Amino acid sequence: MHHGFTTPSRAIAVLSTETIRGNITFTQVQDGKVHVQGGITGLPPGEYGFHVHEKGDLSGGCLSTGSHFNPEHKDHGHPNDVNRHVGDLGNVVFDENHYSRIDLVDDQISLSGPHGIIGRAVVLHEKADDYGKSDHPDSRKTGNAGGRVACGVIGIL
Amino acid sequence: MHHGFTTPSRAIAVLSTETIRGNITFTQVQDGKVHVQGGITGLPPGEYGFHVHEKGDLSGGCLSTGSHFNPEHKDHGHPNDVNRHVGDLGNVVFDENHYSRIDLVDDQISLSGPHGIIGRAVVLHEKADDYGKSDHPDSRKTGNAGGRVACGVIGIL
Numbered sequence: 001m002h003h004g005f006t007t008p009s010r011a012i013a014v015l016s017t018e019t020i021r022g023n024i025t026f027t028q029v030q031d032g033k034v035h036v037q038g039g040i041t042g043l044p045p046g047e048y049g050f051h052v053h054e055k056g057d058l059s060g061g062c063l064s065t066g067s068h069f070n071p072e073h074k075d076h077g078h079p080n081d082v083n084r085h086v087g088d089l090g091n092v093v094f095d096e097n098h099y100s101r102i103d104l105v106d107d108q109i110s111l112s113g114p115h116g117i118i119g120r121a122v123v124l125h126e127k128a129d130d131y132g133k134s135d136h137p138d139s140r141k142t143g144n145a146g147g148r149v150a151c152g153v154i155g156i157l
Numbered sequence: 158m159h160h161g162f163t164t165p166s167r168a169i170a171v172l173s174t175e176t177i178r179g180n181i182t183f184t185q186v187q188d189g190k191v192h193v194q195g196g197i198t199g200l201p202p203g204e205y206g207f208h209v210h211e212k213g214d215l216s217g218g219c220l221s222t223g224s225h226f227n228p229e230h231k232d233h234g235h236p237n238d239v240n241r242h243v244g245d246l247g248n249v250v251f252d253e254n255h256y257s258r259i260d261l262v263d264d265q266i267s268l269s270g271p272h273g274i275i276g277r278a279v280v281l282h283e284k285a286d287d288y289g290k291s292d293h294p295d296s297r298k299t300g301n302a303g304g305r306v307a308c309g310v311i312g313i314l
């Protein structure tokens with residue numbers, strides 16, 4: 001027996017480095033929204049750039065996930081900007097205890113269609129996203145979030 | 158600017174353990190076929206069970222990828238059997254040099270639709286798949302391929 005297409009209603013990405021452990025779950029909710037929730041330990045307190053990159057390709061570590069998932073051909077942006085990339089989910093915040101609570105809802109990423117992020121990569125950044133609001137010349141493209149301290153492919157949960 | 162859906166025409170999964178390194182690329186080819194190619198080092202010579210498991214979930218390591226990708230509700234099988242699971246890609250073979258060449262074409266897995274494996278998991282097994290042809294009582298369900306020495310999520314390449 002052969003079926004039509006089912007859109008997954010939940011996905012997850014797993015970050016594990018020597019220092020870093022995190023699960024980030026992405027759950028399809030009402031009104032074309034996705035509910036992104038997880039928690040990650042292992043960075044000092046502060047803000048770090050958190051994005052979906054285009055490729056679920058780890059053959060070159062985080063470098064192979066390429067650039068920010070951008071099907072709408074827009075500029076780098078704040079998640080609340082109209083001019084953002086689909087993958088531009090802003091900054092995560094590590095507390096004094098070295099633990100990030102992730103808990104947000106984004107109306108641009110999806111679990112299917114042209115904004116589908118299944119098979120794409122979550123990338124955690126070593127410093128903070130600037131929202132394309134600086135005059136570093138990367139700022140309009142990548143924010144300016146430094147290296148890529150961790151990444152994992154978005155899988156079906 | 159907003160787009161219709163594009164089906165990815167290439168995917169990859171990356172196996173890296175303390176001992177194991179491998180890339181496996183999955184490429185959409187003519188005639189509803191997928192061309193699976195890679196190479197993996199780090200096991201002695203022999204046959205090991207190589208499958209697509211249902212979930213791209215690594216939160217529980219390889220255990221969370223669940224069971225064999227099976228949307229057609231069939232039994233475990235040889236890739237050439239009609240009665241197989243979609244995820245039942247048989248055995249890989251490590252040479253005396255500890256290196257697996259993977260190079261095959263499978264007509265059941267796809268990169269989209271109900272047999273879409275993007276976001277699902279490649280799982281490498283510690284011993285060999287028996288093709289559901291034994292009388293171990295797992296044989297009809299999992300073949301009988303032992304533990305799960307490595308796994309990676311299928312990402313968009």
Ligand SMILES: [Cu+2]
Binds near residue numbers: 049050068145
């Ligand atoms: Cu980034």
Ligand SMILES: [Cu+2]
Binds near residue numbers: 071158160
């Ligand atoms: Cu376009």
Ligand SMILES: [Cu+2]
Binds near residue numbers: 206208210225280299
């Ligand atoms: Cu298996």
Ligand SMILES: [Cu+2]
Binds near residue numbers: 001228
């Ligand atoms: Cu069914």
Ligand SMILES: [Zn+2]
Binds near residue numbers: 051077087141142143
């Ligand atoms: Zn961006």
Ligand SMILES: [Zn+2]
Binds near residue numbers: 234242245299
């Ligand atoms: Zn099977």
